[PDB]
Structure formats: C-alpha cells, structure tokens
C-alpha cells in the first residue's frame, strides 16, 4: 500500500493539476472560477499532482482519509447565486465534464457507475451540503445557508472511516458561528477507482446575476491504510 | 508553503514518474535497471509524481526533510560491478542525463550550478557513499562495502536539517550488521530549485561482468517547513 499527505498552507500551481478557469492567485489562494471578466458558466478544477491510493487489492485493505480546507464563496446576488464548490475524488487523468449543476464532475443526472466520482458539494443554488456518489442526485444533504455568509471563510473537515464506510462532513463559519454537518454511508472501494486524484471543482452561474467566485484558501489531506 | 509526505510500503507505478529502464515488479519493488536480458549500460530513474517544495521565498524559510528507504543491489561479479544507485533531488520535469558514472543525473564531471541536482550515491565502483552536489566529484564520502553485502537489503536514513544546512546519511545492513554514515554541509536553497522531484536513479556496468541490479524495496519521505 501507499499512504500520502500534504499540507497546503498557501497554494502554488507547481504541485497541482489545474483545469478550466482554475488559477492560483499571487496571494496563494486557489481561484476555481473566473474572478474577473466573464464569470458566466466559468468552471475550473484543481487536483493534487500525485494520485492517492484508495484500494489496495493485494491486502483486501481500504484506506481511510481526512481532509481539512477553508474556502470563501463570494456571490453578486446572495439570493440567486450558483452553482457551488465541491471536494471530489475523481479518476486519475480525467478531464472536466459538464458545467452548471454538474459542477464539472458529472455528465448525466442519474447514477452512472462508470463515473467513478464521489463529491462533497457546497451547493449555493439549494443552500445545502450534498454528498454526490456517481450522480448529482445526492444520497444525503443538510441545509447550510451559504448566502447568509457571503464572502466569509468556511472551515471544513471531511473524514472517511473505511471500516464503517462512514463519510462525515463538518463545516463552520467562524464569523456567524453557523455550523453544518452531514454524513453518509459510502463504500468507496465500489464507487471510485483503486487510485484517485483528489481536489476541487466549481461552476459559476449561467447568467449575469447568478455568478459567484469559489476560492480555496488552505488545504491539508492525509490518507493511510490500517 | 507546502508540506508533503508519503509512505510506500509496496511500489506502484501509478504515483511515480518512471524513466529509462525503471519498472515496478509484480512484488511491488522498484527495479531501476534491467533485471533480465541486457543489463549492460542499463539506466533508470523514478520520482514521486508530486513536486516537493524546498524553498518558499515568500517566508524566507527552507524546508527540512527526512527519507527512509531500503534497497538491494545484486551484482554478477562482486569485485567488478558498477555503477550504483542514488537518491536524488532534481529539477521538476527533468529528463535523464548521461549513463555510466554520471548515474543518469549529471552530464559534466566538474561543478555545474545549472544542474540543480543533489544526490546521495551508493557507489559500487569505489565502495563508498558519496554526497554529490551538482558534480560527480563528491563533497564528502565514506567507505561502505556494498560488495561484501551483495544481494542483501540495506536500510538507509537520510535527514536534512535546514537551519544547519546539515545533510546526514546512515546505512545499515542488518544481515552483517555493517553501518555506514556520511554527512556534509549543503545549503540546499542555493544548490537546487525552489521545487524539486525526489527519487532515485541508477546505472549498470558497461560490460557483461560489471552489470548489477538496483532495487528499492520501500520508501517513506516527509518534508516540513518550520
Ligand atoms: C510558486 O512557486 C514558484 C517557485 O518558487 C514561485 O515563482 C518564483 O517567484 C519568485 C519571486 O516572485 C521569482 O523570482 C521566481 O523567478 C519564480 N520562479 C518561477 C519558477 O516562477 C511562485 O511565486 C509561487 N507562487 C506563489 C503564488 O507563491
Ligand atoms: C498498482 O495498482 C493497480 C490498481 O490497483 C494494480 O492493477 C490492478 O491489479 C488487479 C489485480 O492484479 C487487477 O484486477 C486490476 O485489473 C488492475 N487494475 C489496473 C488499473 O491495472 C496493480 O497491480 C498495482 N501494482 C502492483 C505492483 O501491485
Ligand atoms: C460522460 O463522460 C465519459 C468520459 O468522458 C464518457 O465516456 C461518456 O460517454 C459520457 N457520457 C455522455 C452521455 O456524454
Ligand atoms: C483535520 O483537523 C482535525 C482536527 O483539527 C485533525 O484531527 C486531522 O488530523 C486534520 N486532518 C488533516 C489532513 O490535517
Ligand atoms: C548538460 O545538459 C544541459 C541541458 O540544457 C546542456 O545545456 C549542457 O550543455 C549539457 N552539458 C554538455 C557538456 O553538453
Ligand atoms: C525514518 O525513520 C526514523 C527512525 O525509524 C524516524 O525517526 C523518521 O521519522 C523516519 N522518517 C520517515 C520519512 O519515515
């Protein structure tokens, strides 16, 4: 097996795979979508350059992982923004999919086993944290008012306890002290490939008034077999 | 800044950049040079897929790192084998250089500041551990009888303490209980690029009787800014 961790105190494009409109600012923040110019239908993705082993066939053992990151979404109109930001596990070498509500991660509305993608979505359209497993129809959600915290930093903690197939998400907006959480049972070994690229993806609104930016400020990840 | 670590208990090509004759066996071992067929002038390199940040200019701070790995060199004729195996820090995206004594890492004998390559060489020709800094003329060496331990596993520990510019190497052959060590003062930030690829390189003898294999069995690495 292979364990791996990284702690991104400030982003640098050198160790990332940037796709779409994703860029790293001079301040070292990950800008997933356009922050200037045409933000309509802007889409970007970014993954750590090294693949992460999730399933080691030889030991019939699965890895557990933990990832913490902070982000900030800044919308034009806090009551009509879209679409959201997502943390995702995707196939190594994969290219962006559909924009809009597909978040650049999916290309069909219904379940598609061949997608091999799991994502934790911070949906600004519905104001919910959603766990999407190979489809945009969430297997679990919980309301989380992102709009009330427009332009504020959110601290997120995601853990995957493999023995229990337990994926847990906790979010906190220190400014308002709003907390959001959601968990779901997801057998990763069946839903994603043996190795995956971990990262983020985001899509901005299709019209002038529904645009918003999606920036990740810091990010640490750790996976290990046990 | 960015910290990174990984623990390779069994090798897999998915998270490696393989060059030359380097391959990963079904047993999960890294075979840097040809183990079957023509081993004459075989050369191979392998690096972790994600670049490692060494110098974060914005903070006027340098990373320290620690790396442990085990290897096995197996020569046909223990008195005439060449050339060796090396742990190296090279420029991101770099391709192999010259073979033979150059180890696939260098292309000139004298110092070349533009090489931006630092290596800890387990030299089978001279039977010494050598610290090469942008040149094959080692800045420090100590005898280490690899031949007397032909085909045996060596456990190596390398640490770089940035505040002191201290690079230390410790090797142990559990089977014979022979230990080798060598240290040197190397200001990494002045000798390598801000970001580097970490890994191995090896070259096999040019003649039938001087050939040998170079296998890495396990490897863990960790770099941290402090
Ligand atoms: C990402 O890392 C690179 C390499 O350290 C940084 O680029 C260097 O920045 C310094 C100071 O601005 C320049 O003098 C060098 O010429 C740059 N080197 C290269 C290869 O571009 C870059 O600034 C870092 N990114 C961020 C956002 O900090
Ligand atoms: C490196 O990892 C890959 C992916 O897990 C391993 O390849 C799989 O091996 C199993 C068992 O042999 C096969 O059933 C799959 O079809 C393979 N998948 C792929 C994508 O190749 C590979 O064996 C691992 N390498 C080592 C040395 O263990
Ligand atoms: C979705 O994307 C995958 C990979 O690009 C492709 O194989 C598949 O055919 C696509 N499906 C549709 C309906 O476009
Ligand atoms: C995330 O934070 C929690 C608590 O602060 C910690 O236990 C965990 O190890 C962290 N994970 C990473 C990848 O930093
Ligand atoms: C070594 O490689 C570099 C690659 O740019 C090249 O400029 C240099 O001339 C090479 N050395 C020799 C002696 O050719
Ligand atoms: C290497 O091993 C030593 C002692 O076993 C340990 O202190 C160190 O943290 C290890 N480093 C890595 C990268 O595994």
Curated annotation (Swiss-Prot), chains A, B:
InterPro entries: ConA-like_dom_sf (IPR013320), L-lectin (IPR016363), Lectin_LegA_CS (IPR000985), Lectin_legB_Mn/Ca_BS (IPR019825), Legume_lectin_dom (IPR001220), Leguminous_Lectin (IPR050258). It comes from Phaseolus vulgaris (Kidney bean). Keywords: Disulfide bond, Glycoprotein, Lectin, Plant defense, Seed storage protein, Signal, Storage protein, Toxin. GO terms for biological process: defense response. Seed storage. This carbohydrate-binding lectin has toxic effects on an important bean bruchid pest, Z.subfasciatus. Antibiosis properties of legume lectins are proposed to be due to the lysis of epithelial cells of the intestine by binding to the carbohydrate moieties of these proteins. Disulfide bonds join 144-180. Homodimer. CDD domains: lectin_legume_LecRK_Arcelin_ConA (cd06899). It holds the Pfam family Lectin_legB. Glycans are attached at residues 12, 68, 107. It comes from the Eukaryota. PANTHER family: CONCANAVALIN A-LIKE LECTIN FAMILY PROTEIN (PTHR32401), LECTIN (PTHR32401:SF45). GO terms for molecular function: carbohydrate binding; nutrient reservoir activity; toxin activity. Belongs to the leguminous lectin family. This is Arcelin-1.
